[model samples]
Every structure is written in C-alpha cells, then in structure tokens.
Target chain A: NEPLVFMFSGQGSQYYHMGKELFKENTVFRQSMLEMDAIAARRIGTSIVEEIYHPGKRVSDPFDSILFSHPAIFMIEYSLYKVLEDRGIYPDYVLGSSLGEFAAAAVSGVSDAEDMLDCILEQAIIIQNSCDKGKMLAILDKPQLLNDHPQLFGNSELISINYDSHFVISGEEDHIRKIMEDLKEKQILCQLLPVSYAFHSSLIDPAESAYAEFLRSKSFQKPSIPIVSSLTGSCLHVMDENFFWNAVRKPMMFREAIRYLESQHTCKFIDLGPSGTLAAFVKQLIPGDSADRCCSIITPFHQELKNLNTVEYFRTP
Target chain B: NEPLVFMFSGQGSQYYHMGKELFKENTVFRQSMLEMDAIAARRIGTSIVEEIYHPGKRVSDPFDSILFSHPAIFMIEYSLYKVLEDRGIYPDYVLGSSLGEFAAAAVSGVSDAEDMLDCILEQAIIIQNSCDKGKMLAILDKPQLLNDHPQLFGNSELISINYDSHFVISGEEDHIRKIMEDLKEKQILCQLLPVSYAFHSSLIDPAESAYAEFLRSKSFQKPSIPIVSSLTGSCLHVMDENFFWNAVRKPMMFREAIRYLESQHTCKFIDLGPSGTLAAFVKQLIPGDSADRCCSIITPFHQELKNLNTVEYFR
Candidate 1:
C-alpha cells in the first residue's frame, strides 16, 4: 500500500485562534501543545498557547510576528500530528513548506520537538536582530508576468514559486508597494502578506551566517520517515547542515516538491496548516482525478467535527 | 524459552593465541578483529591483532601489561560476540566483570565498539601514568582468612570475592608478597596474577579522578539489555559516570552478580572471553543441576573445532 504523506504549512497560514477548538476538545492535542508551551514559556516567559488563544486585554499583540508565528506553526502541526499518532494513524512520509520544515523534521524523528523549538527560537532572534525592514506580496500571475515588466519590480525580488501563476515576492516595503501599485494599475491580483521580515530573500542575508553557526552546534539525525524538502524540491536521504540551512534561506518550491512526491508513488497529501492554502495549490498543480485526493485538516473558522472526520477517514484502509 | 546471557570476561582473562582459531576459521570474528585493528592502528601506531597473534621477539614487548591486555580483551570478546550474533544467537541480558563492563555496554547498545575502545585506551593511559606499582592474588580462601590474620594484611586489601572460598586480593608488590608467604605458611593455595597494577584497590586511587573526568565528558544511555554489574553485584538498569567509575574502583562481586542474574530468571551463561574463568566461577557459584548450563566459547590452548563447537551448540 502507498503510504500517506503529512504536509505541513508555513507562514501566512496561521490565525489567532487557529487550533483553539482542537486544543479544548482533543486531550492528546492539548497535552502536546502544553508540552511545547512549557518549553517556550521557560525561554520566552509567555505561554505560546496563551498568545494564540488569548492575545490578552491590555497591549496589542501581533500573532504574525516571527516570534509567535514560527513556533506556533510548529506547535499546532506537531500537536495535531501527535493526536493522529495517538490514534495509530502515522505518516509514511512528510513534506514541509518554509517554516514547516522544522515541524516535518520533528515528526520524522530527525530531532525532538524541544530541540526544534530551540533552533526556531534562535532563528526568530536572528531575524529580529539582523534582518532589514521588508515585506512580501502574493501575486496571482505567472513568474514571467513580472519578467515582462522589470521596471515595475524595482528592488523587489521573486522569493517563492509556490504554484503556476502563483508566487510570493519579497523586498523592501516601498518596492513591494510600487510592484503592488503597478499590478493594480494593470488589474493583476496581488496582496501583501501580514509579516514584517522579508524571509527567503537577500534582505535577510545578514542573518544567514549567524543562523548557520547556531545550526552547526546542534545535532541532527537522518529522518525516520522520508521528508521531501521544499528548498531542494526532492526527497532528502540525509539531513546535513547544507540541507538544513538552505531550507531556511531558500525560497519555497511548493510546486516542485509536490511533483517530486507524485513521482515517488501514489499517496494522499493531508495539509496540516491553519489555512487550506497548500490544498488549493495542490488542486491547481495535480492533474485530473488525483487532484480530488488532496485534503486539508484545519483551516481558519473550520468546524471541529468536520476536521475530526477528515482525520478519522484516514484511520481505515 | 530461557534467554541467553553473554558474559564478558575482564583483563586477566586474556592470553597469547587467544581467538587465534576463530580468526582463522570464522569470517565474522576475523572481520570484527580487523575492523578493531584498523581503529587501534590509527590511534596507537600498532595493530592490536598483530600484537595478539604475533608479539614477536621484541624484548620490551609488554604483552601481559594493562596497556595491551585492556584493549585486547575488549577486541576479542566484542568480535566473538559479533560472530555469535551473526549466526542468529542473541543475548537477552549481559554480565561484565571489571573492564568487561565497557564491552557489555557496547553489546547492550549503550555505545558503539569504537567509543568503547577510545574509553579503554584512555583508561589504560591514566592508570599507567599516575598509579603506583602493585599486584593482585587469587586466594582459595574465604573472608574469614583475612579477618583472622588482620596483622598479615597491612597495605593489602581484599579486592574481589568470586565464590564462597575463591577471592582476589590486591596491594603493593611487597605487601602482596608478604601476605602470600604468610598464606603459604598456613598451607592456603594462593598465587599472584600476571598483572602489573592492582585494580579495584586503593593503589588505583590516584588515577580515579582523571578517569572520572574523562568519563564525565562521555554520553551514556540506559542499556537495551539488562546488564548485571560486577561492582554492585546487581542489575544496572541505567548507566551513569558513578556506575562507570565505581566499576573500576570497587571490588568485583562476581558471586552476587551471578546471583542477581539467577534471581531475575533461569538462563544459560555464555562466557565470551579468552579464558573460561567466569564459566568455571558460574559452575562453582550456582547450586545443584543448572550448574552444567554455563559454557565458555574460548580458552587458552583450546582447539579451533572445539571453540567453534560451543558456538554451534548455541546456534
């Protein structure tokens, strides 16, 4: 039998109360989140679960900040992965997008969730300290659409090629604004992502060296399950420092990564992200009948029973 | 089904041409020895296998010294253990005496053979450099022998109690010589072991701190198989630096360690060392019919087919 692949989502997919219903209803998911929260609380002095479910009454909180979003993305996916594991529904392989790579590695047993949190915290600090003031834009046009108008892009760069006619661009705020204005004038669909730092771009170049050094001291093992990397757009046999650091600095190859998985064998792709973003991309990418096989477990405003049913369906042959 | 327990013999159990028959007959044993020799050649500038099979005509070749004997014991037992494992003979539990504890840890998946060799080499260096000259003696007597003659054992100390009447004592060479003479006058059968240093005694006190420091830097895990410790005479569920250092400094409790294994469950013991010393001790310690269950794979001057037969019997 072809194995099931659990695909984790990256940034721009998280919501403030994304996993609140599962956290209250599922005991396994709740304990896993609390375990992650316990480690995060010791380091950051605040419960990540608290930051997600209740951002508080006094001061404003940006849930999209790398500090909260990076770990929260992993926390929710890891906990949900555990709940499925508790029910004896384990993945045969894992695929990840950008920040989701850490969660995939944790599930694949390359490292524990605690160690991944430690690496994620280091990444968060590096971006906060050394990165430039930048922004990202999701464009609903082919990558060639921008190549035709070089003058419109200015200093902005195409950072991620997630799907055909669908990509994310990263650069300074003014340059992204200019590109968005040009796209709007031409009636092309484009919108800014709710993130501060320009991830997967040269604007974050200064942080890469420090992050690489931090990664060298950390120990990593070969993944217990096969994990397709978004950076290399292929399945990784070994997780060396080269593969690990590139997964952070390089743009998301979500389309190519899925194509590689398709070439491997027949399997179902279950999106464990907060939004059904990758599932939509999977529908666009895969041809004909197989497109119906892709599904997303959790999304913003999703029903608890509906999400639970999607997972329960996978329990049977 | 009774689980098989592989018991590793310690330092004094090694001899010339030990595992020679297996080296020529078994590919698994030969390959394991060569693999260990490759690692030892890079670190110590000579092949441990070569030193074992052909010590040669060199006048200064300290074949019986702890420097060579320590690593050689581990290399042979670990290799022979691999041969048994290759033939589908697996141990559910492990027992180790003194230096053999490291080999037990390796078999129990606490660490690999390479790391165990590294620790053993470091231990040999520490003892040779810092420790005072001493000796160990095997006495065919009980604890009452020493308690009756308190004045006879001045610097000497009882290091191991192997059985009811079998024990090992360690001390400075002159003090051990004096004790042996007194035991001779009393007509007690006692003989000095062919070892340069007094292990598991106060004579090894100076090297303890350095060895402990070296051990603290190492990573240890819980044994995959239950390992009966010679030092504590109990099953070691977890491995820590305290258990490691104590296994070196404390006297071996062979009698109690065997009893611990017996207390857990019934099983046959396979001694994976050059000498059948532990197998004989097993026979002496266990009561009644099950005493015949113990067997040794290798012994000094033993034939190739005979050594291969014991393993074939297990297979």
Candidate 2:
C-alpha cells in the first residue's frame, strides 16, 4: 500500500454516464468535475457534464464524439483521483497511457490541472482539425500475431501491448474494417475500440507540427511525484520539450511499464480510468499477490461505490 | 421503526439487468433468484434467469416479453424481499397492487412462493393467449384530469391512481396513442409503461374465465401477516375464490392503500419492486414525518447496496 500507483488509461474506455453516481453523491468529485468543466469550457463550447449525465442517455449509448469524450475521460479520471485523495488514499506514483498521460502529468504537478486540461483540449482540436479519421482495434490474440499476418495487419501499426494475450493496433478506417473482417473469418476474437482518431499511429501524422507547437506553448515543471511513462515503460526522468507531444505519438508499452513497476516494488494499482481496463490489465500482468491488490473505481457494470470500498483497504490509517 | 410495510409493485416496473450487483454480491439474493428460476423453468420452458442476466443485455434492453417479465418481475420482487428478511430485517405488513398482490400473498403465507410464482406465470400465459394487445399510460397530472379530458380518455379505463398527481390509464393501442398525443400537445408529462397488455381493465377480460379457474385451483389461505390490498385500499380480511382474478382486473387503489396504513400507524415503507416507483409514491403520500421513512431497493439509478443500507436503517 505504501507504493500505491494510480493508473490513468487512454481512450476507448469511456461510455456515457460514467461517474454519474459519484457526481450526485460525493461533493469532491462533483466539484472537480465542475471545476474542470470550467477549464474545458475555455476551449470546448458545450457542457460535457450535461451530455454525460443526461437523464435520457443510457450506459450503452454511443459517446464517441472525441471533442466531448476527450475532456469527459480526463474529467472523470482527475475527479476520481481527487475523490480517493480526499478519502485519505494518496498515490505514491502516477502511471498513464496515451491520453491518460496528460492526466498523469496533471496529477503529478508536471503542469497545473487547468493547463494540462488545456493541453489535452489543444491536442483534441489539433487532431480533429488536421488528422484524417481512423480506427483502433484491440485483438484478443498475442502481440506477435501482427507480424505473422502481414497482408492482414501490415497497414495497421501495433500501438499497445496490454498483456501476453491482448494487444491493440491503430490504422485507417478501411484497413481496420478489413482486418476485423479477416480476423472474424479465422475465428480470432477482436473488438473495435471506441475512438475517432488513431493516436500513436501515422494516421495522425498531419497534426504533429501543430500539436508540438501547442505543447511548446506551455511550460512543464518537473513532476511533483514519480511519473511512470507508458511510452518508456519506466519512471520518467526528463521533461523534454517534445515529451508531451511524444506522449501522444509514441507506441504504448503498458505491459512493460507494469512489469517494470512490479519488479521495482510491491504496489497496489488503482485504475482511475472511466473504463476500468487498466486495473484489469494490472491484475492480468502482475503476480497472484500483487494482482489481488489492484482495484478499478468505474466500469460499465455500475459499482463505483462498492469498488471504492475495495480501494479503501489499501489506504493509510 | 415501529411498523414496517414491504411494498411490491406490479407490471411495467421490471427492466433488464435488475438487481445484478445484489445477485453477484449477496448469496441469499443469488440463491433465491436461482431457485425461483428453476420453478419458472418447469412451466415457462426457458431459464428466465438467463433471459434476465444475459451477458449481452444492457439495462435498456427491451425486456417486455410477458412470458419472461411476468415471472421476472415477481422473481426480483420476491428475491429482494427475501434478501432483506435474510439480513435481519422483516416486514410487519405486506402491500401489493395487481401483479404485486401475488407476491404480497406469497410473503404473507397465502401460498408458497413457488405456487405464487406459478400463479403469476399462469396469468401471463392466459393474458397472452387470450387477450388482445393494449397499453397502459402513466399521466403525470391530477387523477381528476382524466374526467375533464373524457373525450380523450373515455375509451381508456383508469386502472391505477398512484397518488393525487399520478394516475395510470389502460386502453386499446390506438386509443392510448391518441390520448398520449393529446396530453403531450397540452404539455402534459406522460410516459408509456413497458408492458404488453392493458392490465386492470376490460381489455384483459378475455382471460377472465381461465384466470378465474386457475385462481380457484389454488387454496387461498388467510394472510399470516396483514395484507394491505391496493385493490380495496385497506387491509384484506377474506381472500374469496375470485379474489386473485379480481386483483388482475380491478383498478389500483395505491394512494388510498398508503393513506389507510398511514391513518393507522407510522411505518417504514420498503419498495421491493425493480422500478422503485412505489417507494416514490409512498414518499409523496406519507406526511412530512413519515415521508423520510420510505426507501426503494431497486431503481434505474443503480444503488441497491446503498439503498439496502437505507432500508437497514429502518430495520
């Protein structure tokens, strides 16, 4: 519990009405969501809160407007983190993957929460304005399967390796569709991730220059706490000029990053993502003892209150 | 809490994936669900449990096949009632309206839970095979407004008066659609209840003979606990041969039933229904002192554990 690591996840883990009960029940979570909404409103015109907590929308409702979902994911992550901290559970380190790194940096004091939010909003805008539409597919097969099926997956870049069995690839929409079609014919299990653009792949190459300039526009301070980079799979040392830009563009090493943490210290991994996939990954990645210590706060199953109590066991007395 | 009344609701309250967390976390709740599912499988020919707990289904999944929902509603209501009883909480009096009355009787020892579940399923089949399809609409206004808009609702029977402000009307599909359209045009808030047949009205009268015969087949015993009948808006004394059939084909007297209980004593009202609408009605019907004592364990908002704890406060 002393080495508690708060893991923030990337896109595709979001759904409508995530953290709805927390917003209604907990004051700190509601405040954080609304506070971030104020910051996100500077860039985004609409209220992400209303769209997410709309009474008419169900959990299965499609929430793939990247403009809204990008802020929505970060809003939930940061709000949940605040909620945990308020309840006497503070993380010793923060881990992040893809868009999640922005939240990791924000919580680690690499930048102010507002500025990091602005940076995330800037990335969303830059990608939307410049990059072509794309897709990301999480294949249930191993990471090495991408190399074996050249004709099928040659166009799609391997973006993430979640575990020994699960990996994700990003590519053009048409290529992903064809790859999914071929994978289905072979009876290989695969699911298309909910995302608008292919981050960490060349499909988002058009936004690179503008995104880097936006990253340069803000100054990133040294992290207040240890920052575990999913890109490097270890503790981040340098806050370089291109670090934030590369955070979005680099291939995710989630399994390696997790293993690196596991080898270093025994820790409780708390998933603060909207989808709760990262905690699932930690359970799959770590040993029996270490995996048992992991917990996820929010999931589609709607048990935030119960899961929070599970996480409470690891908190300091 | 001095007095405790467990309220079970009727049709249109059931939804897909109801009481899922309770099924996963509590052994008592899960065991009750599985046992009842076995009893239902004997007659329905399918696992109502699997149909309810389908992995692919969401809360919004269409769960209106009465063959499943009829048993499904009672399954959840009875299972939840059992769960509360298991957790050191027991009801002093049981309340029911329409289909809910079957559960009330079961809990009150009018019959076994298995027999009552069979009774509910039999009613479902008789209504399905015999009655023409119709609708039930919950108009969110004063109950007297139904008479003012007689041209709109004269064809529709007023089946349930939940409170002073809320009432449910049953009619043919075409008549319901026309009434709902007129209500919406006048800025009236109304919602279509998720059900197949117009229960508690003349439309389901086709099932009267078969349903009455099925009711007579079961031995009706006097309730061990007080049975607060929403049909008569007071405590039930005698459960005659046709009582069960009349429960299906009679108007719901929910507001009067609640007030009758309130007039006698102060009690904690626990809603075991999947929708939790009955608990909301209890809160509205009770006085300022009594309103705070009402709780519903299941709702679309998904907080069974917390609400259970709230119910536990009363216990």
Candidate 3:
C-alpha cells in the first residue's frame, strides 16, 4: 500500500479567510473547527473561529499573537485532516514544522484536540509573557554563510535550514534588520517574516523551562501514526511531554525530515495548512519525477474545495 | 479473544529433569532449546541444553552455578512458551519475577532469544564475579515483621512478598540461618531456598552498577506484548537497558503483579518454568472462584508429557 503524509505548515503561513471554503462547504471541517473553538474559548476567553473566520474582525497580523495563530493553525489543519479522513484518505505518517508540530501531534493521536488546544494556549501565554522581543528572517541564499558569516549574525540563531539555499534565522529585531540590510547590500535575497517573536531560536529560551514544566503536568501518548520530529528529523518513538516541549523550541529540520520521508517510498503529500507553503517546499525538495505526487489542500486565493478535489483526482490511480 | 498470561519462575525453582520430557517429546520445544544452546555455547563454553538434558553429567545441585541455572531457567521457560505458542495457546500478557523477566522479555519480542540469552549469561557472569555470597529464605508468614523487625534482621532484606502470608527474604548466609533458626524456634514455618546468592537484596548491590553498565552496551525494544513489570507491578510501556538492571535488583512485587493480572477477566496462567512455583502463587493469589483457571506445564518430579497433556486437557 502507498504511504500518505499529512504535512502541516508553521508560522507565516496563515491569512484572513483561510480555509473559509472548507468551513462553508464541508460539514466535517466546520464541526471539527467548532469543536476546537469550544476548547479554545475556555483558554483564550474568546472564540478562535472568529479570529480566523470572521470577516469584520479578522486581524491583519494574526501571526504575532500566539493565542490567535497557534490555535488557528491547529484548527484549520486538524479540521482539514478530519475532512480528508472522512473521505477515507487516512494518513500513514504526519509531518509538522515549528508551531505546526502541535497540530501534527494532535492529528497523530498523540494528544486529543482539547489537550492540544490547552497546550498551544499555554505555550502562547508563556512565549508572550516571558520571551524576549525578536524577529525571524527567511534568507534565499546558501546557508554556508550561516556557518561562514557568524560574525555578521551576532546574538542571532539559525532556526531553520529548509530546501536548498533557503534558511530562516531568528534574533533581536535590530540584529535581523542589520543582517537583512547587509544581505540586501550584497545583492543576496532575504526578507523578514511576518511574525511577532523569533520562534525556534534562543530568544524563546527563557520560556522553555516554564513551558516544559507546564507540559510535565500534562500527559502524552505514543503517536498512533508515525510523526517525523523536526527536532531529531527522524521518527518519534516516544511521545512524552518533553518531546512536545523540544518540538517547539528546536530548530526546524525540514530538509532532513523531508529527506527521511522520501527515503521510505514515493507517497502522496497533502499540505493541511492555510498557505501552500509546505507544498512549494516539497516541489523544490523532491525530484522532478516525484514532484507531481505532492499537492496542497488550501491556497491564498484558490478555493480549498477545488484544491482538495484536484488532490483526490491526482491521488486516485 | 481469551486473555492468557505466561508466568515464568525465578531462581530456586529449577531441578534435574526439568523440561527433559518436552525436550524429547516436543520438536518445537526441542528446537527452541537447541537455538538457545547455540548462543549460550559461545558465552558459557558448553551447551546449556546438554547441561540440563545430559544423563551422566547432570548435577545434583545445578543452582550452585549462576551460569548454569540462569540460562537454564530462561531456556526452559522460553522453550515451553514456544511449545504452548506452537499449539496456538498465546498469552495476552507475560509476568515475570526476577530472572524469569528475561524469558518474558524474549517472548514479548522486547528482545530476541539469542540476545536474551546473552543478557542473562552476561548478568550471571557479572554477579558471579563481583557480587557477595548470600542466601534467600522462603518464610511462611506476613512481612509485617519486615518493617517492624528490621533491627532483629540486620543486613537482611525483605525481597519477594508473595501471596497471603508467604514472603521471601535475602541476606548474608549467617543472618539468614540465624533468622531461619529463630523462626523455627518460634514455631513459625520458613525454609532455606536452593539459591547460591540473595538476588534482590543489598548483597547484590555491588553488581547493580556493573549490571547497569553492561546493559548500556546492549539494546532494548518496546515490548510487543504487555509485560507486567515486577519492579512496579504494572504494565511496562518501555524496556530500555536501565529497565533490565532495575528488574534484576528490584523487589519482586509478585503479589501486586498477580493482583493487577487478576483484575483483568479470567486468563490462563501457564507456568513456563521447571517448577509450578508461579502456578502455586497464582492459585493462592487468585480468588477461589477463579483459582481453577491456573495450571502448570512442567514440574520437577511430574511427567512433562503428562503435564503438557493436562494443560492441553484443561485448556
């Protein structure tokens, strides 16, 4: 049997009216989203569905608020996952990056939807309350300079090493802007990500212990479906609280994790996020022959229903 | 979907001619026995099956050498487990006391037979070379005195707390003899077990670090079947190296382990060792209503074929 991987997107992938079509057209998606909001309301003291789905009150910068974007990402991904599962397209494996790991953890049955919401809510509170103010930069250049030009990136951290020549760095806002200006002067392509704080970087170190303490009070289970941990870039055998804590703060090993997945066999990849960010990365990561196997369920402009239909069309032999 | 539990006996239960009838009568049992010997020959420099099965060379007191008794217990238990499995009598869970944990580990797919043999053999080598000489006693009384009479039983450790008033204690040979004599004078029943060393007592404390270090060199896996850990008297979710080390020295929570197993509905408790030691414990631990559910396959003087037929008969 062919293996299927459900890929969840992390920060900088959300937008207003994201998953609006799936929420309107699919009952399964709508119910799952509403169910999550029931739990999210208790934690955030407001409706998460309104933050993502409401036309009038939708924020322009939801990416910065962990309380809004974290649950929003998980709700959209988990709802879309339920939609796909209802269609009998169950995943053999799950993949997530950074904040997306919580979504993946929930879908993989490592934790229930309510506990996942509580964890993300608590995580956002910790980061918002304790972490230093910082920013992230997506550099479109070979990361040899990440090691070679350490002198240029003082107090900054290499957070993500994505598909060839694509790297994400996080640090103090000024430090990132300085490095961004230096890259611009050198004709190197790079831009700042629309995020409130520098995640998967040392700026979040202050919250790690507290977040770990919160997680230790909670319970975890071994993933029913295999989860490719971004921290280790390998299959996670144990799904304890420390595993979730590490998944949040560790650098996103997206390239290595994808390589590990590709080594298993050619499989269909369904990106369960607002933007088709992971789908685009998979295109650059996999070979041209196997690239046609990957697709995204939702896009910035296109109807998610149409995108999902295309995925079903291409998946059926 | 009937739940079954495979119970393996620890030390002091082995005897001559144990599992010899099944070794001769059942091919499945014999093959599994020989496979263990192939691995044991490299470690112990002789066939473990031969040591147990050979007519002329069989010893009166095989328990003296940890090398002989350790692998022998595992080999008999594991091979008997294969015989039962071959007949389609599979266990939903496996329970082990001390050394019996190795057999349970192998059966649960936590480790392979060869690897289990290597671990047990290595454990025997470490304990024999590094550990102090001590003895174990099976006392016929509640262990309330274990906490209250510590001053009276110096250097002695309360080890296995079995069903009802039955309990086992381990300590220096002199202390054990003194305690056994004291119990006898008081008209309290207790007997010296046929073991060379106190397994789960402080006497084995020197070997704990060495055993833990030795385990680090090897690998372990999540048990494929449920393993009721003797250390915690609960289901073991992970079986790493430290787990094995703890299993070796931790007090055998047989009473608690049995209680946990009994909570699950009726399950066949098959004693896969040389004696009906665990089977006897199950009978006492389980209620009178469910007491008829437990049985033994191999005993010291009982005919192995008759016992096997009886298990097949009762089952």
Candidate 4:
C-alpha cells in the first residue's frame, strides 16, 4: 500500500464561482485550458473553453449547457492535473465521488482530459435529454415524516441515499411534487435541486443507448495506476465497455471507497477538487486518526500546491 | 407469434449511387427525409442530408466536416418506414443485420430516427477514434481459408461470422494484407471493407463509457413492436441501456437472429432496405418448401429500378 489517499468530488460539488478565481490569476492553468480548447476545436469543431470562459470582461448568461458546464469543470481538473504530474506529484490510489470518477480515471492515467470530457458530455446529454419529465429534491427528514401520506410513494422511488435520513427521489414531476406537498403539510424541510434530469433512474435509457454507441467508439488503453471504483470500492480490473456502461447506472459506493482507503496500514489522504466535501465525509466516517493525517487541495492557486509535498506516516500500536 | 417477419441488412449492404432515383421519384419519402434532416441539423447544426446527396458540394468546409456517403440509403429506409408506420404497416417480428440494426430499431417504434442517428454517429466516432491502426475485410469465402492461413491467423482472430461463409476480421493493417496475399495465393474471392471502426474488439471501451452515461441519461420506452436482437438473436424484451451497451460490443449474431426468424410458426419476412441481402441469407437458410412464402419489400424497389429480380425462390 502507498502512503497517501487521493479523493475527487462529484456532481453536487459544481458551482458558478468554482474555477472563476483561478482563471483570473493562474497563467499556466489558463494557457493549458486555451490549448485544450484549440484541440477540441480541431476535433469537434468548436472552442469549448471560449464557450465557457470568455475573458477580459464579466458577462451574465445562465450557463447550463453540457458544453459550458460539465466539460469546463473537467478541463479545469485536467489542466491542474497536468501541472501536478509534470512537477512529479503522483498518488498511490485514487478515488472520486460521482462525476469526479471520470477525473479519477484521468489521475490513474487510464484516460486523458479528452476521455473525461467524452464521459462528461455524454453523461450530461443523456441525463439532460431523458430526465426532463422528473424532478429531484433533498429530503431533510426521514420517510416516517410522511407516515400519514403512505400513498405518496406511487411510481416514485428513492434515487439517492445521500445521508442516513436524507435521500433523493426521482420519477414523474407531478408524483415528486405531490410528495413534496405532503412533506410541506408535515412541516418537514425539503428543497428541489436545480436539476431537470431524474439521473440514475430508468427514464434515461435513450441516453444509455446513445452512450452505448459512444462506448463502442473510443480507444481505451490500460491504465498504469490503480483506481478504486466509486461503485464497488474495489480496484479496477479489466475496463471494457461493460465496465463503463454499468459504472454510470450503478449506485456509487463512495463510502466503501473511503473505508477501503482508511484500511491502509500507513497513509495520508488528499481530496483534489474545488470542494472539501469528501474530506468532511472522511472525517465523519473515521474521526480521530483519519483527520489527523488527512488534507485537502483547495487553497489559493498562488500558494505552493501541497500535493507536491513528500510526507510519511506510521502506526504506533 | 405474429404472422410476419422483418429482416435488416448490415454495412456491406450499402451501395454507391444507392437510393438516388427513389429520392427523386418518391415525394412522400423525400419529404419525410427532409423533415428528419431538419431535426438532426437543429441538434448538430448542419444538414447531413445535403452533404450525403451532394458530395461534390461539401468541399472541405470547417462546419460541415461529416462525409455523407450513404445518406439516401440509410435515410430512405428510415423515411419509407416512417411512411409505412404512419399507414399502420409493421412487421410482426423485426431483425436488423449489422448497421441495418438502426433501421430495425426505428421501425419497431423502439426508437426514433433522430435518436438512432445520434446513437449511430456516436458509435461511428468511438469506433473511428479507437484505432489509428488495423483494417477490416469482407471475405466472400468461408472460414476454412482462415484455417489455411496459419501465419496470418497468428495474432488476429475471426471477428465477424456474418453468415456461413462470409466473415470480417480485425487486426494490424499488414497482418490483414498477409491474409489477402494468402487468399490471392489460393485465388479465394475477397475484398477489404471501407469501415471507420473495428467493432467487436476491445478497443471501444471509451465509447462504452460514454454510451453508459448516454443510457444513464435517456428514458427508453418499451418497444411498441418487438425487434429481434442481432447479438442474442431473440425478441427484444426491453429497450434498456444494458441491451444497447452489449449491442455495441457484441458481434453481429446474424445467424442466431436469423434462426429465431426461421423457427417462427407462421411468418412472412420482408427485407426493406437498399439491398435484399438478408432475404438472400433467408433463402439460403430456409428449406425449399416454406421459402416460397418469404418476401422482400426491396425486391420491388430493385426490380423496378435495376432489372434485378432473380432472388425470388417462391417461383
């Protein structure tokens, strides 16, 4: 086992201001992104960077397109990774949360930025096109809150088990709204997330079909680095088309990936993305010892990146 | 259990200058196609129809980069099916051969042409991008020739078993040439196919990832009509992502799908694409007694256009 753990965040970690500060100050990050845009333009015939980050002035446009949102985040992750890799910063085992799985695949050297972008765009479109009929909401309380409203479960199913009591439901918009109204009557806390797609549901099968074709298209080389599966928390074995297909649909076992990381003999952990959410989750999972050795990579871009640091830790007992 | 059978042809079924005259004469077919093209152009921002029909007009432009070679062939199948479906014409059991599977999916009301085009284009890119190396060959001969060429079969395996004798192989370009040279040595008839991707190989994992995400994102309604699987050669139980994902990586099990069609108790088969290749295979497979009942919609199209109707085994 290596001496350190690296984690990446997923969908809920997205923000309008995530990489905004970095692009303004970081020249290397900015230039690398521009170069990626040029390459993407040559292949797909559009500058993905320009579409997301138009420079020299501030602008107001509600950016929700897969091209503008998902691809840009991946581009930022890849460019930052390239800088770190060139400086000889590497991890023993990599873990990612949800959408971050694609980036984790990149860190494992299974694929490049282009590969991650491929999954990101494909996932975004599949979710966008297929999930329009559904709505998603975060339920603050347990299901017992709706004890009197047992009939509200009609056709709707729990889509995500985010926390112990907190979960997300996906189905027809009317069905979701009726349940929410029932919760509202009980004075329970619930807010619908700004997501049009009922992702991780059967509704997205068409997206899956298009993605299947995408699966048959790309040239995937074997990765040199080992990647822990967010779905199963096992080391990735053979990464064929089936692996890619099921990875998206299956429930991500992020907690299991964390447990696997914690079981290592001697290690330090790092979460390399915009948010420190996974770091907090690790703290909550294994409190006393894991926090002492854990760290996150979300400080100012001007500061010396801690990933390039050489450190070692050991067991006392 | 329905009294009808539907068959689909694959990639090699496409012909140069195919479906051109049909587009000119069939207004309903052309209008349906034009409507389909407009839908696709709205999504991708360019009319692929114009690019397909007028190849000379697409002179290396930046925005219109796609080479539309068999637009009319694929589109006519889709457009004619649209006309047929609107008029309540449908097959009881449907099966597509290779690329013609797109048409089968469309006709079974399992998917629409727009979604099918998106799926096909995504597949084309994934398969095309997977290998800068390797090649594909459509052999007119059987598997024994492959056994004869021990040296050529060294690293490569038989990738496609299209039917009894015909096959497609994927390997290094030189290795493919080595087999071609051996076939030439034996005077066995074969030709290299012009395909963008080497399918049924391990190379397309990236496309698989993207496709998984595509499936994760799409809402597939159950098929209104049952479409037979080319991979499993059975009735499509559900139009789910798992089925579609396997469809991309799995071999074109034409033999299996065809066997399912033949075993049907009472059925009349129709090959509705540009070529009657599936019908030819059906004639070859079915016994002489019941073979007379088999038919092809494309038989009339080809006979009226090219004076070719020799495949009628019923007479």
State each model's CA lDDT, in order.
Answer: 0.79, 0.84, 0.79, 0.59
DockQ-better candidate, 2 vs 3: 3
lDDT of 1 by residue, B203-315 (tens): 88899899989988888765776677787676554344556666667788888778756764677889887678898889888876876578887876556457556656654
Separate DockQ for every predicted complex: 0.01, 0.00, 0.02, 0.01
Candidate 1 lDDT by residue in tens digits, A1-317? 44577888777777778777789889998999998999887766788888788745211233567887778888999998887788788786788887889889999989999999888877887888888767888998887877787786778777788777788988888888888888899888987776787777888888889988899898987666768778767666456685555666678788888886665455677888777777888888888688757788777665754866776676537
Tens digits of lDDT, candidate 4, B93-205: 67766666667777777677777766666555544554444556777877676677666456555666666677777656777788788778778777766443444555445
Q: What's the DockQ of model 2?
A: 0.00
lDDT (10s digit) by residue, model 2, range B1-315: 367889989888888888888888889889999999999999999999998888898888767788999999888988998898888788888999888998999999998899989998999999999999989999899888866767767689999888888989998999899998888888889988888789889999999999888877777666777788888776664455666787789898888788767655677888888888898888877776767788898887778998898887786
lDDT of 2 at B278: 92
User: Model 3 over residues B1-315: C-alpha lDDT tens digits?
Assistant: 346788887888887678777888799989988888888888889888777766764435555568888888999899888888888778878988788888888899989988988888998888999988889888888778667766656768878888778888888999888987787777778977778888887787788888888887887776788777677675554444466766668788888777756554467787787778888988888778877678887876657777767677445
Write the residue-wise lDDT of candidate 2 on A1-317 in tens digits: 24788999878888888988899988999999999998887688878898888889887776777888888888999999899989888887799988899899999998888888888888888889998988899999876776776776868898888988898889899989999999888888998888878878988889889988877677777666678889878666456777777787889888888886765456778999987899888888877666768889898877899889898788744
Question: Would candidate 3 be rated incorrect, acceptable, medium or high by CAPRI criteria?
Answer: incorrect
Per-residue lDDT tens digits for candidate 4, residues A77-174, read: 66666655555556666776556667778777777777767777776666666545465666876756445555755666665554445556666678
For residue A43, model 1's alpha carbon misses the true position, in angstroms, by 2.4
- Please report the candidate that would top lDDT against the real structure: 2
Model 1, DockQ value? 0.01
Candidate 4 reference-contact recovery: 0.00
Which scores higher on TM-score, 1 or 3? 3
lDDT of 4 at B127: 48
Question: Which run of 10 residues does model 4 chain A get worst, by summed lDDT?
Answer: A308-317
List the candidates' TM-scores in order.
0.51, 0.50, 0.55, 0.44
Per-residue error at A120 for model 1, in Å? 0.5
Task: Show the colliding residue pairs in model 2.
Answer: none
TM-score of 3: 0.55
